[PDB]
């Protein structure tokens, strides 16, 4: 019925290695945000996909209410004990925003407001607590808190005793801060005027003028993010310096005056490390020995006097370390299962934590206070929402301390499996879903079908409310863990970027093909999401298997590769050659352009699609999946359903931030369940 919006063409030649690309769309991008040809675009798409969209009011209304009504908007967390006080944050139906309470250890009774985010957020248009922690003699809170909604947050202090205030404020800042063992001193990160990456780190004292904040260190290299740490024993304040590929530690005297930094080990390409300090020894968990890291204990920096406690291995990819009393717990993944291991520091007793599920995932969870033999760790599976478990390291006693309470929901009717593909070139692919069992029928189902597939980041299999709004209309839900994810460790985030990144498709598509073929799903209601890095999945996969697909959602996809990697004026862009590679060198320029979703566009078929992006900021800006979209309603050859969806509002926290994040969901799901009908 209805024309779809037509942007204007204005051939832009981009020459590079000699290869001539027009962009006819190239345009849209407006750094200055003022071209009003522009802006027409994206409200026109907009107003399209409001009247395209239009008929399924009603589904979203449902998919909606069901989605808020699974919720307890009642939620108190669990309360940790650090430093002699017992904290907990609470969430009430009345509240757009938590509530932060604390209470001397041996009180039960009475709790104090720490902070209340719905006073902090009076007369303000914007609200986000960016971190909270109070000084080490329990007399004064820090506070990161940012107004403007632009991720620049202010450090605030307030003196406990009389719940006043002091008067200055620490601009533009990280939100990473530590306080030294004075309680009167704190070092904080301090982001670049105009690039706004973390880059210079500054000593602070307490109700001072911040002009006369002394710089302690400032980082050369913008690829290296500055963050700031403070060791189990509190002798060291960390230096964090990081790329994608090395790091580099300085340590802070925590306890004396006038500290420089210290140099840990001077970086040096793809030797990644980090450290804690504890029981007088440094622990580092480095990749200096093997792409799955190992862990080391040592009395000083010279990385030629580390000690190997866990020497790396090929099967297993050592992610984390917590340090205890009597033990060492790490966090481990093999076999593509996340798990923890515990050895006592004297007796060298190993114990695994055993689980009994195909489909989860366990981490360390937050445990503050190192003299105890209770770990926190999490548990979240497909069938299991999120479980918060204590374990006594000595005992085994294990107990559950909170667990997400889902309405409307019977465990018993989900069932899950873990399957593995055999790719096309031989590789095993870990594949992990979940469907109702009583509208289970094999050949039959819709299949959605989520990945990812950057930055080692794994989509681990865990537990959705959202999610049984699909499975409770008879669709199997599935996370393909493709190369480029972390799910097997290093080895399988290396074969999935940079010379690589084409297998992160090849593995998607392989999955898919694999679960149609063995019965799982409907090979006409095959549907397909991601987003950012999952979105240029989503881009690839679609130009290379069109028919695979009935219909895709794309959120905020990055889809303009070799264009936005040869421009350092777009943000992301100098941090990310270690990812994609720098199309600056032809190798790169070429097998990047092979799978760059918006240049391999072509006259073809394509699935019905849903594309978003948003103009505040996203990883992707707001340019990319509008071009894309101008290209595809010009190129493509079939008459399916091509909707953009461009988040105009700057986004709220606290409880309608949620409201809105639930909106876009439920808007999603209709579309994909009205192509499913």
Partial sequence: HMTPPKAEKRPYPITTHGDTRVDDYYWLRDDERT??????????????????????????????????????????SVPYVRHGYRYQTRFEPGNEYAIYVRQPQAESEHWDTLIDGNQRAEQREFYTLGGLEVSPDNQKLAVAE????????????????????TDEVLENTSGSFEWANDSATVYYVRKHAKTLLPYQVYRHVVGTDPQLDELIYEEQDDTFYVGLEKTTSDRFILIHLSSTTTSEILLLDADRADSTPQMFVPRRKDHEYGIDHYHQHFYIRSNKDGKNFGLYQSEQADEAQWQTLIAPRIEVMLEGFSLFRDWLVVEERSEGLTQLRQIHWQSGEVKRIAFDDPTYTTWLAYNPEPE?????????????????????????????LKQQEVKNF???????????????????VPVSLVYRHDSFARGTNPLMVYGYGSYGSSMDPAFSASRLSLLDRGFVFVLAHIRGGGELGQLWYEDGKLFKKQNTFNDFIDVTEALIAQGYGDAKRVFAMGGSAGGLLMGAVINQAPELFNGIVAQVPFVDVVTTMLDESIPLTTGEYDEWGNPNQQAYYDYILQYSPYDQVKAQDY??????TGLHDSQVQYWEPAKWVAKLRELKTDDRQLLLYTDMDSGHGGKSGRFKAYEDIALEYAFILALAE
């Fill in 35 to 76: 071209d009003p040809q522009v802006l027409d675009y994206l409200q026109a798409e907009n107003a399209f996909t409001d009247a395209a969209l239009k008929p399924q009011q009603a589904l979203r209304e449902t998919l909606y209410e069901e989605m808020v009504a699974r919720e307890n908007l009642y939620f108190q």
């Fill in 146 to 165: 940012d107004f403007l909604s632009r991720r620049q947050y202010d450090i605030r202090f307030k003196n406990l005793s009389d719940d006043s205030w």
């Fill in 372 to 400: 105890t033999e209770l770990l926190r760790y999490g548990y979240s599976s497909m069938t299991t929402p999120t479980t918060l478990y204590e374990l006594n390291l000595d005992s085994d006693e294990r107990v559950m």
């Fill in 410 to 428: 019977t465990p018993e009717n989900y069932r899950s499996e873990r399957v593995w593909v055999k790719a096309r070139d031989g590789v095993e």
């Fill in 607 to 612: 699935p019905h699609m849903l594309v978003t």
